[PDB]
Amino acid sequence: MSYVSGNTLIQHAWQHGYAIGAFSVHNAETIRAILLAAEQEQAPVMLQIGQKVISVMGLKPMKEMIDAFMHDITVPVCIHLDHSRSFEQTMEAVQAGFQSVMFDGSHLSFDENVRITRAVADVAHALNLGVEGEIGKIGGTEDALITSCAEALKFSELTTVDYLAVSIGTAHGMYKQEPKLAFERLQEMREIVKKPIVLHGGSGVPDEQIRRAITLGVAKVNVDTELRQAFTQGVSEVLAASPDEYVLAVSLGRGRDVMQQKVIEKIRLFGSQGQAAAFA
Amino acid sequence: MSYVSGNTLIQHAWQHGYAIGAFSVHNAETIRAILLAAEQEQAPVMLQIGQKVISVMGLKPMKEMIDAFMHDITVPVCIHLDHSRSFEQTMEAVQAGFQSVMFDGSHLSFDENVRITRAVADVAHALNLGVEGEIGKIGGTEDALITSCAEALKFSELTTVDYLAVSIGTAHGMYKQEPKLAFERLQEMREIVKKPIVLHGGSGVPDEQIRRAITLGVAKVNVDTELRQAFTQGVSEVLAASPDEYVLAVSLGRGRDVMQQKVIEKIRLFGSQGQAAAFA
Amino acid sequence: MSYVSGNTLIQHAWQHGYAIGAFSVHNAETIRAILLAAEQEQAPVMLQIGQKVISVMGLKPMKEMIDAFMHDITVPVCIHLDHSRSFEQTMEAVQAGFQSVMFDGSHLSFDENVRITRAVADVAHALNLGVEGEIGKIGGTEDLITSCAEALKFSELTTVDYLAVSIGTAHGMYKQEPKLAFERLQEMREIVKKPIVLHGGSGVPDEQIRRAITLGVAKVNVDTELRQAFTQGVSEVLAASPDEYVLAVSLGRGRDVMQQKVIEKIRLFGSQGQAAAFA
Amino acid sequence: MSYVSGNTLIQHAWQHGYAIGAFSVHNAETIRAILLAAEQEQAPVMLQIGQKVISVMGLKPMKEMIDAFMHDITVPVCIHLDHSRSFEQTMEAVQAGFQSVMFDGSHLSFDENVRITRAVADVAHALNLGVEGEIGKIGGTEDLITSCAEALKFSELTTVDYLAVSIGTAHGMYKQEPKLAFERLQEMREIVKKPIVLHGGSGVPDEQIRRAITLGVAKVNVDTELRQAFTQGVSEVLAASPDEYVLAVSLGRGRDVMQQKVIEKIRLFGSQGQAAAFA
Ligand SMILES: O=C(COP(=O)(O)O)[C@@H](O)[C@H](O)[C@H](O)CS(=O)(=O)O
Ligand SMILES: O=C(COP(=O)(O)O)[C@@H](O)[C@H](O)[C@H](O)CS(=O)(=O)O
Ligand SMILES: O=C(COP(=O)(O)O)[C@@H](O)[C@H](O)[C@H](O)CS(=O)(=O)O
Numbered sequence A, B: 001m002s003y004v005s006g007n008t009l010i011q012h013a014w015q016h017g018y019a020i021g022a023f024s025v026h027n028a029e030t031i032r033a034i035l036l037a038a039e040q041e042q043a044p045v046m047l048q049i050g051q052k053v054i055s056v057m058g059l060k061p062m063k064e065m066i067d068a069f070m071h072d073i074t075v076p077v078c079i080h081l082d083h084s085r086s087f088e089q090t091m092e093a094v095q096a097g098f099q100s101v102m103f104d105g106s107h108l109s110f111d112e113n114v115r116i117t118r119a120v121a122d123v124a125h126a127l128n129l130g131v132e133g134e135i136g137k138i139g140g141t142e143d144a145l146i147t148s149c150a151e152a153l154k155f156s157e158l159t160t161v162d163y164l165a166v167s168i169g170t171a172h173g174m175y176k177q178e179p180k181l182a183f184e185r186l187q188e189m190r191e192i193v194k195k196p197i198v199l200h201g202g203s204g205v206p207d208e209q210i211r212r213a214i215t216l217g218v219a220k221v222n223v224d225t226e227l228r229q230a231f232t233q234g235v236s237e238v239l240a241a242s243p244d245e246y247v248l249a250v251s252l253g254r255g256r257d258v259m260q261q262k263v264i265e266k267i268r269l270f271g272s273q274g275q276a277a278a279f280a
Numbered sequence C, D: 001m002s003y004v005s006g007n008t009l010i011q012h013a014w015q016h017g018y019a020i021g022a023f024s025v026h027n028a029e030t031i032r033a034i035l036l037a038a039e040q041e042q043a044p045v046m047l048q049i050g051q052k053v054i055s056v057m058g059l060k061p062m063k064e065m066i067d068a069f070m071h072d073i074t075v076p077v078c079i080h081l082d083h084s085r086s087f088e089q090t091m092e093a094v095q096a097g098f099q100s101v102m103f104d105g106s107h108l109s110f111d112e113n114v115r116i117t118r119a120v121a122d123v124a125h126a127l128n129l130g131v132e133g134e135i136g137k138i139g140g141t142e143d144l145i146t147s148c149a150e151a152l153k154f155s156e157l158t159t160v161d162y163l164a165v166s167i168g169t170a171h172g173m174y175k176q177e178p179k180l181a182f183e184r185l186q187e188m189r190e191i192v193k194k195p196i197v198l199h200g201g202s203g204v205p206d207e208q209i210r211r212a213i214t215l216g217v218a219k220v221n222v223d224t225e226l227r228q229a230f231t232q233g234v235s236e237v238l239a240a241s242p243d244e245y246v247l248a249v250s251l252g253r254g255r256d257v258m259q260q261k262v263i264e265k266i267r268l269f270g271s272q273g274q275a276a277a278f279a
């Protein structure tokens, strides 16, 4: 299997001014869409297993499903636990052979966030897998919110996370108003924190703002909603036109194909196309 | 894992006048729908991997996906290769640890069908997995067709198949005209062939004809199209009502739930509910 | 697989006045000897993978070898990492699916021992596997006693599930007969109130083992004496027939004599028949 | 894993005037000896799992043990079932993911041998693994030659990829020096035109091996001589120190001496460096 530490991927992206796309998976077709995109683009990629799919499918089953679809894949892949709020769940992903974990202590006090994140990072460092933490809440779309540079620095130094999620103008879900990222804040963090930044709420952010953020040290861009939209739209083109089309290979296949093209588009936006060669 | 030879399942069904449902799988949600149904019904079940899903997902990946979803399953499960027209493909399923295989030589001459089916059966017998063969073409829905008792007997004795697919009034797909099964022919085969019969084209056959066929020795009923219809209808209830519902857990979840209820209905039709206790 | 948390095994032993034998494995035959013994005795067992076998065979290979021999085994089995002096190595055992780990910080300062042992314990608790730590050096026989207060403090700060302490044993063939610190064990039974692990279990007189178990020893580590038994079995064959090249015969005999030693230890420990308690 | 069809290995050897060594495994140390040898020599190798080790350790466990030791191996490896006299057992090896099988019908009538061997070969061809059959009994040394016409007929009716024939070898330690039937091998090279398997390869003089390989022997089976080497290594340690209980030392030495024997056989066979041809 071509599985690689998320730290190896993110640091290479960070050092060369591109980003790794971190694409949320939900089932078989979504896994295949992402992997086929990465393989086509000769790009390293992260597949994110988050809280919702863990509640529906289970953590270990989703890991095993990825494994089952890796047989023909040659590009660097990293399975990443997204938005974990439990030390136990994060350790379960470690035990199941994930290449990256996010412990999201962002709803905890500063001190508790630090304590658990550091514990998770010490395990990740020991086993050469990536660790992500978050300082500052990032909510849903449905000035004060922005993470300070000093807070990011202190959190970063106390936890030793490999890559850091901060609050910089994004939110999860379909954007009601177009977001405007805190570019000055990203630049400060690049100079002072000096760690790869993770952009949460990557779906629906204008392309130009993504490209700029990446030049300022965003090295991981999380995308979920926009892929689910693409998948759903592909399914709809089929079932709306032919409600009695019962061949799942056709209806879900189209969802898969449309999602694949979205993932290709994101890989290219992020600058990660061709970068598989850097890891061979 | 609670995996059991398809021969053990089918013979028990045959000996006690019920049938094992053989439910075609296509992806993660369809697997889960079938397994959750079987577990709820305390029923033995077959999961069929056929030609279409092998072309989309691959043979080994689908096997591995089933494995990944078996963690919480206690009822007897048998993974079955459906409609294989290649000795190689059938041997690949054997190598991948299937519990049952169908080599479908029905488009070959009688002698070639016999030759390859026998070869497949000798391997199946050696490894204690189920083997299914077919004599007589069963086409699509879109007197002469009916398999003779003598042909079924000769094929059966030359091949040593464990369970036998024959042409008895069904066809694959959505029925244009309601089918009428060849009940007299089934009764002859029960008395003379004396092997469990497999009913292909089980989707959309009237319940009463299914129940009667089972009393005449049909012990495996294959169902695919009707489950795909149920899955598709569940997805449609969601996406038609809310085209912008992008939570796959909701849209595909509903497909999964509606398919699960169809599978429950089929298990009960077939008489296999509660029969897990017979194998504990 | 019939794999069980080391904590489940040890707590049950501790509550019921018996001990789990923790038998060191080295290769295929030694694994099978221990498993065949446990199955015969219907006993829960720990198989210990320690530093020596990790250097020779590798951590993950030895884990996978145990897995390969578990096909016909029904009794509770716990794979346990022995004498780990590295957080990394201990995390590797966790990642490879061990059911128990010992982080042995006994060569570190009290504070460092506590710090790393606690980190290890938090991971073990999260994943429902056993954690063992050690306070007090336990050396070799070729070459003292842990205080009750130190054992208590270490135990409460680390949250280990079972605790190795220095109570008069040593690793290796004993030159002189050991005498266990029974008074100290008894204090610990009342004050520390955790299952105790006895290191250096090889060659300890049976009656001292039985008494130690009543005072709260719930895990007894045995390695040298099994390797002696294995080596003696091989010798009976090769000394008698130097040209006996059938390994099934020479190493088979090592395996059989080792199996009987393991049976003897299981029965000494009181763990025979106890598989029933965990079904 | 660097696992390769036995047919790919043997055909390449046959085409290039060398042979693949087929080394019998018995346990962890013997597996590692063979693999470490192959890796050192950058040689393709077969590891043979035969009847004895199946009775002691089990077919699937030995397969899984090899898997566990392949983590650091880069050279072509083929796991091969040796001396199977059962269609069921041969199918079990196929199901467990072996890269080559021998169905040995040599104690059956010609017709039965053909029937079962052909059935086995059809499965092997379907799954791209090697198939070996045998025509002519090959016995033991403690206790003849296959005709060219019989070898041809058997070969054409079974479609085996490589063929074991009776050409003057026997299993075990040779009492008297063997003399291979070189004239008969040479006939077969021109007429049968299939890679030949040499059973009873232990103790065959080096020069006779080299000549046999030029006449189309492309697989040489070696077991007894490796078990001798392993046993001699163990003896050097236990005879000198009966109380040496460190298995890493006693069995380690067996492993080291066996490794050197395997290196010697690889080089004899001409397979050193040949890993390059398959990358
Ligand atoms: O931060 C993210 C990007 O968000 P958008 O795609 O909406 O822009 C992801 O990492 C999601 O937050 C994730 O879907 C929630 S769960 O853990 O998967 O349940
Ligand atoms: O015989 C069957 C029942 O048919 P219906 O469900 O239409 O009534 C199945 O066994 C199918 O024939 C199968 O879907 C084709 S493939 O091999 O899966 O591609
Ligand atoms: O403590 C033990 C008992 O010692 P005895 O058998 O001599 O009485 C074991 O747990 C050993 O200490 C172990 O062999 C060392 S290593 O880690 O396996 O290298």
Ligand SMILES: O=C(COP(=O)(O)O)[C@@H](O)[C@H](O)[C@H](O)CS(=O)(=O)O
Binding pocket: D024, D048, D049, D050, D051, D052, D053, D082, D083, D170, D171, D172, D173, D198, D199, D200, D201, D202, D203, D221, D222, D223, D224, D225
């Ligand atoms: O043919 C062989 C070479 O014999 P020598 O090493 O004595 O020369 C091997 O293939 C053996 O025949 C094998 O040990 C028997 S078993 O099947 O492993 O029990």
Ligand code: NA
Binding pocket: A171, A172, A173, A174, A175, A201, A202, A203, A204, A205, A225
């Ligand atoms: Na968003």
Ligand code: NA
Binding pocket: B171, B172, B173, B174, B175, B201, B202, B203, B204, B205, B225
């Ligand atoms: Na139908």
Ligand code: NA
Binding pocket: C170, C171, C172, C173, C174, C200, C201, C202, C203, C204, C224
């Ligand atoms: Na000792």
Ligand code: NA
Binding pocket: D170, D171, D172, D173, D174, D200, D201, D202, D203, D204, D224
């Ligand atoms: Na010989």
Ligand SMILES: [Zn+2]
Binding pocket: A083, A138, A172, A200, A201, A222
């Ligand atoms: Zn997020």
Ligand SMILES: [Zn+2]
Binding pocket: B083, B138, B172, B200, B201, B222
């Ligand atoms: Zn059909």
Ligand SMILES: [Zn+2]
Binding pocket: C083, C138, C171, C199, C200, C221
């Ligand atoms: Zn010790």
Ligand SMILES: [Zn+2]
Binding pocket: D083, D138, D171, D199, D200, D221
């Ligand atoms: Zn032989």
